[PDB]
């Protein structure tokens, strides 16, 4: 209900009916020197995944966080 959204990267009240936080992770060109591009946010369904995408979905508040 109150999870973290990537672009502003702040605790953004998740919208009505949406109570998830997808930590979508996948590798791009610079995955070699940077690491998996991280993506947090809100959802009502654990989002779908692509061959290289990996996603951990919280259900509590502010538990969609990013490693240091």
């Amino acid at each position, epitope marked *: 209900t109150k999870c973290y959204v990537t672009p502003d990267a702040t605790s953004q009240t998740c919208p009505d009916g949406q109570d998830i936080c997808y930590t979508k992770t996948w590798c791009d060109g610079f995955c070699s020197s940077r*690491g998996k591009r991280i993506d947090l946010g809100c959802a009502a369904t654990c989002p779908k995944v692509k061959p290289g995408v990996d996603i951990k979905c919280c259900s509590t508040d502010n538990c969609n966080p990013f490693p240091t």
Partner: antibody
Amino acid sequence: VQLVQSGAEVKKPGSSVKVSCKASGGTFSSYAISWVRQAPGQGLEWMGGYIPIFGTANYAQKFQGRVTITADESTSTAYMELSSLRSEDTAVYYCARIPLRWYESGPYESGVFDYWGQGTLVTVSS
Amino acid sequence: DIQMTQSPSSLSASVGDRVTITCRASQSISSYLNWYQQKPGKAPKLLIYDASSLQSGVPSRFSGSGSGTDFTLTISSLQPEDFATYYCQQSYSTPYTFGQGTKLEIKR
């Protein structure tokens, strides 16, 4: 998101210019403000960029030591100050928001300028 | 610095035409190439990002394609609004580099 820059400026050789770039409608911190000068009937040249979150400014080798980029979250205004102005510095100066992509290591810049400001022309002549 | 060279320096064409603009990179920049449009007296505007992605509110006529060093911009149905200098700017290295620009004229 809109960027509103300073007015035109006529400056003399050796003088120094400071150009305002005011961001509006968008998160100033989660974004990055770069600068790119366009000489008359010439192409666009990246001068540098400032990510407020990090407070550090990444300047091009050319303009290293003459360009000083600053940001004031309070006024959400960004500033580019070029010193030792030469005639060849006569050009339109643009300020552009650069989205930031979040990798595992840290927030990194995505070299896409989503928003560009009304240019500011600095005319350097004696 | 990564050197980027748009090949169609000038390309005259009619509104009933389809135009493709070339940009070549000195280094493999992969999918990191943005496309912009600058009309006279106006600031650049981003047409395509990440090689093929199209920003919100950009005429679908604008399509972008390529990877590595060679990239292409397809304007599809030329409209008078779509006649201007177009620029290719890599996003791969800190020294962000732009192409010389290609000016779209009206074949008359």
